[PDB]
Design an enzyme around this catalytic site. Structure first.
Site, short mmCIF file in Angstrom:
data_model
loop_
_atom_site.label_atom_id
_atom_site.label_comp_id
_atom_site.label_asym_id
_atom_site.label_seq_id
_atom_site.Cartn_x
_atom_site.Cartn_y
_atom_site.Cartn_z
CG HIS A 348 6.99 10.57 -32.62
ND1 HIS A 348 7.66 11.13 -31.56
CD2 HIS A 348 6.26 11.56 -33.19
CE1 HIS A 348 7.35 12.41 -31.49
NE2 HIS A 348 6.50 12.70 -32.46
NE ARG A 540 1.01 -0.35 -24.25
CZ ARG A 540 -0.07 0.19 -24.81
NH1 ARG A 540 -0.36 1.48 -24.64
NH2 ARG A 540 -0.88 -0.58 -25.54
CB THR A 647 11.60 8.64 -23.46
OG1 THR A 647 10.36 7.95 -23.35
CG2 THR A 647 11.63 9.46 -24.71
CE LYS A 651 10.35 8.39 -19.05
NZ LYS A 651 9.07 7.74 -19.24
O1 LIG Z 1 3.79 6.03 -32.93
C1 LIG Z 1 3.05 5.58 -32.06
N1 LIG Z 1 3.46 5.32 -30.80
C2 LIG Z 1 4.71 5.60 -30.43
N2 LIG Z 1 5.12 5.37 -29.18
C3 LIG Z 1 6.40 5.69 -28.93
O2 LIG Z 1 6.84 5.51 -27.80
C4 LIG Z 1 7.16 6.22 -30.02
O3 LIG Z 1 7.52 7.62 -29.81
C5 LIG Z 1 8.50 7.88 -28.80
C6 LIG Z 1 8.69 9.39 -28.71
O4 LIG Z 1 9.41 9.83 -29.87
C7 LIG Z 1 9.81 7.12 -29.12
O5 LIG Z 1 10.76 7.28 -28.08
C8 LIG Z 1 9.53 5.63 -29.24
O6 LIG Z 1 10.73 4.99 -29.66
C9 LIG Z 1 8.41 5.36 -30.30
O7 LIG Z 1 8.05 3.97 -30.34
S1 LIG Z 1 5.98 6.19 -31.41
C10 LIG Z 1 1.71 5.31 -32.37
C11 LIG Z 1 1.38 4.95 -33.69
C12 LIG Z 1 0.06 4.68 -34.05
C13 LIG Z 1 -0.96 4.78 -33.11
C14 LIG Z 1 -2.28 4.51 -33.48
C15 LIG Z 1 -3.29 4.61 -32.52
C16 LIG Z 1 -2.98 4.97 -31.21
C17 LIG Z 1 -1.66 5.25 -30.85
C18 LIG Z 1 -0.64 5.14 -31.79
C19 LIG Z 1 0.68 5.41 -31.42
C1 LIG Z 2 8.91 6.89 -20.39
C2 LIG Z 2 7.66 6.05 -20.37
C3 LIG Z 2 7.37 5.15 -21.51
C4 LIG Z 2 8.32 5.01 -22.68
O1 LIG Z 2 9.25 3.99 -22.33
P1 LIG Z 2 10.16 3.23 -23.42
O2 LIG Z 2 10.96 2.29 -22.57
O3 LIG Z 2 10.98 4.30 -24.07
O4 LIG Z 2 9.14 2.53 -24.28
C5 LIG Z 2 6.22 4.37 -21.48
N1 LIG Z 2 5.35 4.41 -20.47
C6 LIG Z 2 5.49 5.20 -19.39
C7 LIG Z 2 4.44 5.16 -18.32
C8 LIG Z 2 6.67 6.08 -19.27
O5 LIG Z 2 6.84 6.88 -18.18
#
Ligand SMILES: O=C(/N=C1/NC(=O)[C@]2(O[C@H](CO)[C@@H](O)[C@H](O)[C@H]2O)S1)c1ccc2ccccc2c1
Ligand SMILES: *Cc1c(COP(=O)(O)O)cnc(C)c1O
Ligand SMILES: O=C(/N=C1/NC(=O)[C@]2(O[C@H](CO)[C@@H](O)[C@H](O)[C@H]2O)S1)c1ccc2ccccc2c1
Ligand SMILES: *Cc1c(COP(=O)(O)O)cnc(C)c1O
Lengths: 807, 807
Positions: A348, A540, A647, A651
């Site tokens: 991811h 975030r 994502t 939305k």
């Molecule tokens: O990968 C992490 N977080 C992500 N958050 C996202 O939103 C990501 O996944 C989504 C779903 O595929 C993508 O749409 C986002 O682009 C991507 O940043 S990946 C991640 C990595 C290390 C961590 C370590 C401790 C706690 C949480 C962590 C989350």
């Molecule tokens: C969809 C969603 C995210 C992911 O948003 P990105 O703009 O893709 O980082 C993060 N937080 C909340 C509360 C959401 O509903």
């Protein structure tokens, strides 16, 4: 009131009303003279919950009888949000409950606002898991979500003096009506100990035991009477001076206490490693138990799929090996075959700081048997690499699961690829980045393994639930079938020149904006112009998401207005929200900068109500459901190559905002679906970023050649936005000038110019709305039903189904 | 089946059956194919619980409307035991539920055995509170039990190699259906801080806050539709690096984590002091809140009684002062008047080591404002003593609340007497001991303050519930009214020469013994002769209770049998059970000695089944309900002057055992009621103990003059009962010979001779049973209804009532 919300049948309204009063009396032990809105919320929640029960029991006994292949979605995060409305929508009970509650003198919307978000996730990764569960149920898959029941989810954010403060999210305070404790299915999880080699084989002994207690939450499909299970494990101390021994039970129970908030950033803490093994160990026992209750593990991969979300549950691979080899006595090679065919890995993120590389000395102490197994996996894997690329010794060190250095580490991504039959990224460009750069070596060894599964969002929560007005006007034209077949929204293209529809679309938006403007005044005591363009960036706080680039634009608009006060400009309300990880200092400074800009801009009499800058506090799923339907402009402005998918972007597209964004993550595919004409694309492509890195990024060059940019930096350094603390933003300025990994300045000019084109189009309401219609109409691809159908067919080997079970 | 268990009406059985299936489905989320006995237990529990709800709400709104004086019973212990059967009995639902469950193919007795004891108490003090709650509800008093909801109650005792092992009593593991969380009534409790003196007055600032969350448990009266409340407080951390801050919330929540197991022994731990203040602070806020919801506190004592159980909630006195003076701004003198008239103090023990004397430096740090108030109370109190006994300076130091020494301490008993309008002991002899010795100085100052309230037990739990056979044969003769008017048992004297009744009494006993003998074999794999005399001593293990004296007798019988194997002796099963406090080494050695004697006696072929010695593991309320109805002989053999009352004694008397005992505690009054002819009295009176102390107790003298005793000591020292560890019982021998505070040897001869008279009578079944009838028939005084009626009239100023509320 409205079609999509289902029937308000007289007999159903009557039954709901009486079960509501029954729960108020027998469950809550209150009368109507002492009950508060919270009591009413719980009575409603219990009343709705009762309707899940029969379907939940029926679904699960149906899976027992038919014995389909089971899908296990392992994640450390499930960002569920509120459950009440979602359950009503999926059971077709919303108008009935609305009617029933109205007849008892209650406003259902008010009671819905009392429910706490289940915030067991950081953001997009956790929310993806939640959307995925909804889609899996809707598609009739025998799917289980497995994770940890954190006592404390993502922290509540308070802004004090413009700074983020973190408060414990005590979400279980008043109880969670949606979970069922299953203490009878409690399982042991082992830690520490050492390995003993016998004649019979290896044996892991002298372990400390922690108990894993499951809590099951129902996951209803959309109007198909399927109810799947999300099983979350809670840590319990086993029952075996005196006072202190009892108080020390807390140490074991700390494993499930709190969600790590350090999103996209690996810290390597032991407690986090314990969490990862905890979820993996309990889950696999549960999986194996369920498989045996139908010696021969040849059929295991025909009956089980395990989907690993990031490397966080990567220990599933050596744990499955451990169980098959040490306990079931399979030979290594057969065990390995079963494991590989059972597991699949989704990546991811490619941010280097997010990569999990656990120190060997940690694994050695905590999970000595698993480290031995990982070493063995590594040796057999590198023998395969050596045979395929003979002589290529640098490839061997590049591909090894073991990284050498001052501290030896295990690369969990490499482990995942080795032990999975499929590896996927989460948007086309990201999956290509995996094959071309990050996992190039592995792609060359096993190209068949690598796939794409572009992410999606559930149209239930993210259209019907949060935007009933829009869902309704769409349903008036094309019926209700699109809600579980979102491609049907294409039919809306034949209404792009329909004057009534254009009027309806723009009316729904305006109503959403008024509603959200009211929420702001009511629940946060701040006034905004509802005729302004709602310019929204919610996600975030991270350098890669470039909230700072947005800030530069905001300051540019401000300086332009001050330079020519009496010229017209399209009024804007600029909204930025999101949480910073507690130890991410730069992210915390960015929040403070946003509030500081707001302090200057929002109080400048010359600006008026032409520009407003609001920081949206405590951004979370329930707040996303309010702000996204109110947005006109969606900011998706990450440096090309850094946002794996995104994502939030989807939305916004589904809810009638236009997108300004870079060609990053799923933005590429969104632009492709809607047409680039209907998308505000700007900035470096991935290729441009690479060219600039080869040459060396010099921010100074941009500062030298763009006067507007120079002015902003000088305002920042000099203390214009921090009068009492002139040097407050020195770290920001220094980072932008000398160590900006994300090239904020490189995209500044094109961003500002692209923002002028946004303003231009917004001056023509009719053409804005027509472009919106073209976005909504092409958003079908970004349904998680499509995503999950692709996982099912191409990875799990199961066929989705929209056939209903008997009620 | 039997009369006392109520009606099995067709419509009621039908409704119970359907609500049972409703709960199994909707509450437990199970079907009948997967449900276990535990699920069936919970479904029944929820079904029965539903019947309390209307009555509970009605009772409490009735108290709101009529606004009677409210009684607040403050205790750190409530030893409730199981709730299911008790609730059925009190609601008249037992046979219906029996019938309903039978018709669903279930044995209700089996499901009753699944319920965990609520073990939130150590023994007699905690159990007295439980009996008292039952009586208060039955007598229609507006009464609240207030305490702490411990996460872990009294430990489960396992015997390993003859030694006590302690296991955490994880009683909430599967949930507690009988409690209702009331998180909305959560209150703040303050600790630490410091005192600031302003113009306005004193102010307690910079405190650490712990939240007190109430859980309410219903307390049903006997067939009067009254349901009172037991409110137990749970400790919660307030919501206001990051990971560790969240994990540190455990520190605050540790306050309600575990019950201190050190019964009748003060240790002076800070966590215990926090528990005491926690319960007091939350309770008084709740009391005041309820009083205000009807400026003028003149009527406070007309509407509130607070009963302090031992000194454990003694901080209620300075806390009430603090609130009235610092927060309500009453002047000291008026506040004091209100406090004294509101509070009353019950003393439950005169053992010096049980007296709470808190180090001043502890109070100073933890509760700085309360220490200031205590000093002020002390100064004004000693001024009163000085004026009444001018010149008597030693009286001043004797009566002071402050004790001087290396460490200054506060004497909490002195505080209680000073701040209460009534002080009572718990049996006539004990209350006299208070006036004559321990509180002599205070009695001379304020004689009107001192009272007696002889303890009682509830005849619901301790006859009807645990001995239905006996309750039935009694009801056949005299009807059912005795169950809430136990004096009516006197009518049984006119059946003492009735041959059918004598036969019935002896039949009920024999059946109880067979049932208990079966329990032993089934649940603990040990065989006993059910025709033997069941000689039972069950209570906490303590030197003062002289389990060792019983041991000496057992060894004497054993040596006599070995000396003359072929002589007849009345067969005995000697049963001893009870828990030792974890750090009480001598108590743990006594347990080990009992099991060691059992190892020798139970395996000696010459002894046969003529003498058996069993240690009853994990003695607790649910086990008392089984063993007490099976007992023939009740051992109540504490050194005269040490057992304030005892209550086990009463349980045995009510259930058809004869008593062998010293003239101690309530034994005196039991002998007085039944006639001394019908009681096996032996040993020193209090006066004899005093005479012997003046002269000096020399154990050696008894060893020198009693050969049988000498033989036993030599067996102990030499290793007869510990072959592999010859010196194992050296500490016991040394204690008995040189530092026996409880004069075991002094009562040995008379005890043994008295035991021979017991055996003699047991050889004549008819005369044994007639003496039994005379005991049961005179046990009426020892109903807690009588006790509570006396508290109500003579202390609280309220009239009990047997009038029923509408159902
Ligand atoms: O990968 C992490 N977080 C992500 N958050 C996202 O939103 C990501 O996944 C989504 C779903 O595929 C993508 O749409 C986002 O682009 C991507 O940043 S990946 C991640 C990595 C290390 C961590 C370590 C401790 C706690 C949480 C962590 C989350
Ligand atoms: C969809 C969603 C995210 C992911 O948003 P990105 O703009 O893709 O980082 C993060 N937080 C909340 C509360 C959401 O509903
Ligand atoms: O007094 C205590 N325990 C008692 N247990 C009893 O059974 C006593 O009260 C009964 C009810 O009045 C009497 O019948 C008993 O004779 C008396 O010993 S008093 C006591 C004292 C100090 C403690 C300190 C920490 C924890 C528990 C404590 C209990
Ligand atoms: C009644 C009771 C006690 C008190 O017994 P004594 O013999 O008076 O010490 C202790 N424990 C339990 C479990 C009881 O039921």
């Amino acid at each position: 009131q409205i079609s999509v919300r289902g029937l308000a049948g007289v007999e159903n309204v009557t039954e709901l009303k009486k079960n509501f009063n029954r729960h108020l009396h027998f469950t809550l032990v209150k009368d109507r003279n002492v009950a508060t809105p919270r009591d009413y919320y719980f009575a409603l929640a219990h009343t709705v919950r009762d309707h899940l029960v029969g379907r939940w029991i029926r679904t699960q006994q149906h899976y027992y009888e038919k014995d389909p292949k089971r899908i296990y979605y392992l994640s450390l995060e499930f960002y569920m949000g509120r459950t009440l409305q979602n359950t009503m929508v999926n059971l077709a009970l919303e108008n009935a409950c609305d009617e029933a509650t109205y007849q008892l003198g209650l406003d259902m919307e008010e009671l819905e606002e009392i429910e706490e978000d289940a915030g067991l996730g950081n953001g997009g990764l956790g929310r993806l898991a939640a959307c995925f569960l909804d889609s899996m149920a809707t598609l009739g898959l025998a799917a289980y979500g497995y994770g940890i029941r954190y006592e404390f989810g993502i922290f509540n954010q308070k802004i004090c003096g413009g700074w983020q403060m973190e408060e414990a999210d005590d979400w279980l305070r008043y109880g969670n009506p949606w979970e069922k404790a299953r203490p009878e299915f409690t399982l042991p999880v082992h830690f520490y100990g050492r390995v003993e080699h016998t004649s019979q084989g290896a044996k892991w002994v002298d372990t400390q035991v922690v108990l894993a207690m499951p809590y099951d939450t129902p996951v209803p499909g959309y109007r198909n009477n399927v109810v799947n299970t999300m099983r979350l494990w809670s840590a319990k101390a086993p029952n075996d001076g005196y006072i202190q021994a009892v108080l020390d039970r807390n140490l074991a129970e700390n494993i499930s206490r709190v969600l790590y908030p350090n999103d996209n950033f690996f810290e390597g803490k032991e407690l986090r490693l314990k969490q990862e093994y905890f979820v993996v160990a309990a889950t696999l026992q549960d999986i194996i138990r369920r498989f045996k209750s139908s010696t021969n593990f040849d059929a295991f991969p025909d009956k089980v799929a395990i989907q690993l979300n990031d490397t966080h549950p990567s220990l599933a691979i050596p744990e499955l090996m451990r169980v098959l080899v040490d306990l079931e006595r399979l030979d290594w090679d057969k065990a390995w075959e079963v494991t590989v065919k059972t597991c699949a890995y989704t990546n991811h993120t490619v941010l280097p700081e997010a990569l999990e590389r656990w120190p060997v000395h940690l694994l050695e102490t905590l999970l000595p048997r698993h480290l031995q197994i990982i070493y063995e996996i590594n040796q057999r894997f590198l023998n395969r690499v050596a045979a395929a690329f003979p002589g290529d010794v640098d490839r061997l060190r590049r591909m090894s699961l073991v990284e050498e250095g001052a501290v030896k580490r295990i690369n969990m991504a490499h482990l995942c690829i080795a032990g999975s039959h499929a590896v996927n990224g989460v948007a086309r460009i990201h999956s290509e980045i995996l094959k071309k750069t990050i996992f190039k070596d592995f792609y060359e060894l096993e190209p068949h393994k690598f796939q794409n599964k572009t992410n999606g969002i559930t149209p239930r929560r993210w259209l019907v639930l949060c935007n009933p007005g829009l869902a309704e006007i769409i349903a008036e034209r094309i019926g209700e079938e699109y809600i579980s077949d979102l491609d049907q929204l294409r039919k809306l293209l034949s209404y792009v020149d329909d004057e009534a529809f254009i009027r309806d679309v723009a009316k729904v938006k305006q109503e959403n904006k008024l509603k959200f403007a009211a929420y702001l005044e009511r629940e946060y005591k701040v006034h905004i112009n509802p005729n302004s363009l709602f310019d929204v960036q919610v996600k975030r706080i991270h350098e890669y998401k470039r909230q700072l680039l947005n800030c530069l634009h905001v300051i540019t608009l401000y300086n332009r207005i001050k330079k020519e006060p009496n010229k017209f400009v399209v009024p804007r309300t600029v909204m930025i929200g999101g949480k910073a990880a507690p130890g991410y200092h730069m992210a915390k400074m960015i929040i403070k900068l946003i509030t500081a800009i707001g302090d200057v801009v929002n109080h400048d009499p010359v600006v008026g109500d032409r520009l407003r800058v609001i920081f949206l506090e405590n951004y979370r799923v329930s707040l996303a459901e309010k702000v996204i339907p109110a947005a006109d402009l969606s900011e998706q402005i990450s440096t090309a190559g850094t946002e794996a998918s995104g994502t939030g972007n989807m939305k916004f597209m589904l809810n009638g905002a236009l997108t300004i964004g870079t060609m990053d993550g799923a933005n590429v595919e969104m632009a492709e679906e809607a047409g680039e004409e209907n998308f505000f694309i700007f900035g470096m492509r991935v290729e441009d970023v690479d060219r600039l890195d080869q040459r060396g990024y010099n921010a100074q060059e941009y500062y030298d050649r763009i006067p507007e940019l120079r002015q902003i930096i000088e305002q920042l350094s000099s203390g214009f936005f921090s009068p009492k603390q002139p040097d407050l933003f020195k770290d920001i300025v220094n980072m932008l000038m000398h160590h900006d990994r994300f090239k904020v300045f490189a995209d500044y000019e094109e961003y500002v110019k692209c923002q002028e084109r946004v303003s231009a189009l917004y001056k023509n309401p009719r053409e804005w709305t027509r472009m919106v219609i073209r976005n909504i109409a092409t958003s079908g691809k970004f349904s998680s039903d499509r995503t999950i159908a692709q996982y099912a067919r191409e990875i799990w080997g199961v066929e989705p189904s929209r056939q209903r079970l008997p009620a």
